Amino acid sequence: GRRPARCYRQIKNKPYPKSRYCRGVPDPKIRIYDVGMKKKGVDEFPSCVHLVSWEKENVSSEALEAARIACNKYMTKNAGKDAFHLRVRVHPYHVLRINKQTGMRGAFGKPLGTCARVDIGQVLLSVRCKESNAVHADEALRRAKFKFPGRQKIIRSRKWGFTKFNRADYIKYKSEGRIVPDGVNAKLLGVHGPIAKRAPGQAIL
Amino acid sequence: PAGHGLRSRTRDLFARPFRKKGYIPLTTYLRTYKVGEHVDVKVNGAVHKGMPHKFYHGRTGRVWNVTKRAIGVEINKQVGNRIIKKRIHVRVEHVQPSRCNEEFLQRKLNNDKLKAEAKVRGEVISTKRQPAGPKPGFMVEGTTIETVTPIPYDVV
Amino acid sequence: AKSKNHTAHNQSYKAHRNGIKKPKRQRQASTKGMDPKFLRNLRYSRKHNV
Amino acid sequence: QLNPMREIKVQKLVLNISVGESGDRLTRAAKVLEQLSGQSPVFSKARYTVRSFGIRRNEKIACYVTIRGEKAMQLLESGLKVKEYELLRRNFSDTGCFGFGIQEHIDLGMKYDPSTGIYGMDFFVVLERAGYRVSRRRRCKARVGIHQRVTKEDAMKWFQVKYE
Amino acid sequence: QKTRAYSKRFQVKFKRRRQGKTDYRARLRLTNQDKNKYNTPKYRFVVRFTNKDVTAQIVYATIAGDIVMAAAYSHELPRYGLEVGLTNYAAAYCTGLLLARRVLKCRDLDQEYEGNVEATGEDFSVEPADERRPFRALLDVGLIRTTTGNRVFGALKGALDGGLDIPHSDKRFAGFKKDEKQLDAEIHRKYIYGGHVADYMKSLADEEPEKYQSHFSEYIKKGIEADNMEALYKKVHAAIRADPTKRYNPKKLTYEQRKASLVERLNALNSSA
RNA sequence: AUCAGAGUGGCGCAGCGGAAGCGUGGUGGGCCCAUAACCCACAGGUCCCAGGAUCGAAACCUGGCUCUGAUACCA
RNA sequence: GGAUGCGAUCAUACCAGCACUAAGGCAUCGGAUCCCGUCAGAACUCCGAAGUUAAGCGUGCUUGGGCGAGAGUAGUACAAGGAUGGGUGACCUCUUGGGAAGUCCUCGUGUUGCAUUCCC
RNA sequence: UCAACGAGAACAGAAAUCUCGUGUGGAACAAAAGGGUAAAAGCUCGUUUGAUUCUGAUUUCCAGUACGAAUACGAACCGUG
RNA sequence: UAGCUGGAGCCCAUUACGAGUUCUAUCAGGUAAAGCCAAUGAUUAGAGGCAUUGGGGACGCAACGUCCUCGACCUAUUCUCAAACUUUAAAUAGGUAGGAUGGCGCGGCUGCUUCGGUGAGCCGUGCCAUGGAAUCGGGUGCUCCAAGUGGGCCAUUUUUG
Ligand SMILES: [Mg+2]
Ligand SMILES: [Mg+2]
Ligand SMILES: [Mg+2]
Ligand SMILES: [Mg+2]
Ligand SMILES: [Mg+2]
Ligand SMILES: [Mg+2]
Ligand SMILES: [Mg+2]
Ligand SMILES: [Mg+2]
Ligand SMILES: [Mg+2]
Ligand SMILES: [Mg+2]
Ligand SMILES: [Mg+2]
Ligand SMILES: [Mg+2]
């Protein structure tokens, strides 16, 4: 089957994506990235926990699928399947090659599999949930850590949900009526646009 | 030949700049060149006649000849342990006047004036530029002083 | 047996042994290759100088 | 506002007859269209070679003519008498103009001067106001201002309020 | 109605192209001097027609913009006698003839190059007198179609008979026979003296009592019968040769008044229900 | 392991861009007491799949899938 | 404050929606004998002044799109040189120097040459 | 002025032909790829043979040799307008 | 064969002429980074709208009507990317200039150029020009004759399989 992953751990080549040049690639192991509930709104799940890469390396598509399931199955059992939203933050866009009497004559490898190029301080997995269920968040990612090769940390987000606002700033801007919801995202309102496009409680300066 | 064409590797070098394609402004055609001026070569993608080879792009030479529609430019090219002074003709669209001695002429005429001017007075001065040297002493008025200190490390 | 080899190693050292020579700057530069119409006239002007 | 330069007027009437053949069928469609127009028609060669209609590329299949002047007004209202001077109200383009179709002989002009059949035809007429030249002249082309354009609503009224 | 990406990638054309008044392919090829002449300007003999006037100019190219050597108009013909028909073929000959004479007087050579005094239908070229060749200009026709009988070629003949050297061929003069490949000097001369208008004056007043009234009202107003073309134009020609020579728009609002009005619109909308 | 070949009617096969057939088999009448044989008609096609160029493709290049022959030596 | 002919720069000049304009100029506009031109006097060409500022044009407006600039991003990313520097390594650090880019925010929306002409 | 899109017209539809609007090229330019081009370098029409003669110079290759190819003049004869 | 080397010289020389270097001024670039909420391409998820009918069920005694359903499609967002993508855009490195081989006046030449002393250039004369940034220093400057070599290998950095 696959080689031991150590053959492909270190980032050593320029990116080699599938293209009109690279074809005949296999299909990646991971094909679903947001599992659990991706229908809840911004204001519901405010606490967020991340699993962050801490050394530059490749992460295979299989390893990234295995981590998804390990995190999913755990977080389901304790807090219920509707208590969390798991999002994979890395996509396997890099192709790997394999060179299978004949020696190093014409040694350019044919494609093997797919992997993701990760760097220091880069998020691998993110989970948003209620503050109460944060424990099953902490352990689910840690249980997922053992599916990844390198070094990873579990850093709790200073922001709200999966949005770019501090919990401090989002609440202030929510109570002031300056943030309109979107879904998983929030949309702060500014001082620009045509005046008539605003609803009469939403025009601000 | 011999492994590479005339316009090999000129994908980015010969392209026009972004939103600056199409029409060539009339200023390029109105500039007049004289044997001895300095000219900077930069190719125009649109004009496929009179083009210089890609080595001459971004180089500054002297005018040595003028025909209709073309200027003879004079670029040095290092080949081994020597410098060959290559002589090429490029169409006007591919050259622009240089400002490599803009300053020299303004300083030259400035030099002559002061030289004759101080000669009306006692006739010894030195019109030489000087590299920036060290600052003399001076007193600073006591005002608001803001302390700065190292910041404690924030984990995020 | 692998008989193709290329490198620029040592070549800048060889180039700079006897300097990167520049050609001598000359008063009365050469007119070879200029516009023949211009050059005939310059020759004729000099023929009839007093 | 009711400025007199704004009076709506037909710039052209175009008659189209599509056949899908050549030789004599389309040639006789030319004569009915010529004798209806009073001017030498033009043929329209095909494109894309759609074999379901049996047409090749660059082979003439249609015949149209673009009349304007008093021949247009005389010829237009005869077409509208055939339609009993009413239209489907979906017949009006969003921009400014409208069309309809008939079965030939119900106009005025004898049938078998050449022994030529009943060619149905496309009457398509385009309205304008004064000053549409500014988008059609060669020097200083420009968009006709919005207020000088004819909308579907103005064509609706032009049809009903007068002209009949 | 156009997307944001459309505007970001958009390139505008040269202004005189957007406004649709200059053909830059012709402009480059008209103005572009050979580099081994160094400043010798290429003078353009610009001839333009409005619906109601005729503009003529001798100009040459500069980086700051063109520079007029001499300008003339047909609305200043009433000075020399012609009152009506200031945009027709004959007027163009008068406007062209006027421009030639002014610049030749302005360049101090009109004595040397008189042109020819009696306008002839023949294609004319002035001789290289001696030591001072005649002034040279290029006909710059603009955007109009160059057609046989076009008035711009009426203007061309006037300048040639004024004493200018303009590169030309006779195939577009009025009277040229596209099927016989020869010039008809008689038809050309009739057009020069406005006789082609005269024929249409006769043709209406006979078979059209009212079309002759409305269609030539200013001619009739001033007492110029169709049999008074050759006489009347010749005088205008000889005359020209003998003497060639507050707030209503709103101002932009300041910063304060835009911010003033914007506060109102904001207060109005927020308070609007 | 690479590479040549070949995928078309139920089956075996032909098809040189305007472009679908040969044998046999199927279906309905006839002949016979009745079957075959014989006679008269009738109906058949994801042209292996996905592209791409092409007046215009089942045919021409590219990729994918399946059957067959091949060459793989000195140690 | 306007305009035309020819232009320079070639978006602060473009795009979208709107609103308005004294004079003069442009334009729209009337016609088809003539030159010319087309299926078609729509275009183009020619002759014309009966009307209209409706359009073109010009100028202004918009918490407009774009474009331009500024501050920030950020001494961050990166990167020249040095270390018998740390670390198993990936990588990172210090020393001597250089130093970006989007989001986000604030402001702005042309300048002008030659010739002839209009104001009032 | 293209690709394409919107709105319309007997048979007529997803698709035949016609009409108006939008249209920075999203089309086309013999062929690979890249670059280039919008009153063009694309399309249609007219007229044509500069795909001509003479020998030098220069650029790419490079030893600063030859060939191939290209460029800018000189001296002619023509095309087009 | 060119490069690198020796030998022979010769010609000038602290006037100047330079330089594997900086400073001043001025050109050129598309790699690192960045971007995608900018074109091309790849790619995750929702949210809001909506059709001239991609499809139907139900209501349509009808339709130039809809509620759902997978969804196109439209708008504002969102995760993640690119050796053979890119608006932007470094650090290092690249080119040119920093006078005596400069400037001016006068009067001549031209068969080139101009409407034209109009220019372009050159010639002769006569005047000026505190030497026009720092640092360092005699020169392959010129020429000839010729040897050996044309298997390389190693280290830090960038980098392909
Ligand atoms: Mg090579
Ligand atoms: Mg060879
Ligand atoms: Mg070889
Ligand atoms: Mg470039
Ligand atoms: Mg060529
Ligand atoms: Mg070797
Ligand atoms: Mg032209
Ligand atoms: Mg049977
Ligand atoms: Mg039987
Ligand atoms: Mg053309
Ligand atoms: Mg060669
Ligand atoms: Mg040797």
Ligand SMILES: [Mg+2]
């Ligand atoms: Mg590159």
Ligand SMILES: [Mg+2]
């Ligand atoms: Mg990169």
Ligand SMILES: [Mg+2]
């Ligand atoms: Mg960027």
Ligand SMILES: [Mg+2]
């Ligand atoms: Mg993108």
Ligand SMILES: [Mg+2]
């Ligand atoms: Mg530099």
Ligand SMILES: [Mg+2]
């Ligand atoms: Mg040897």
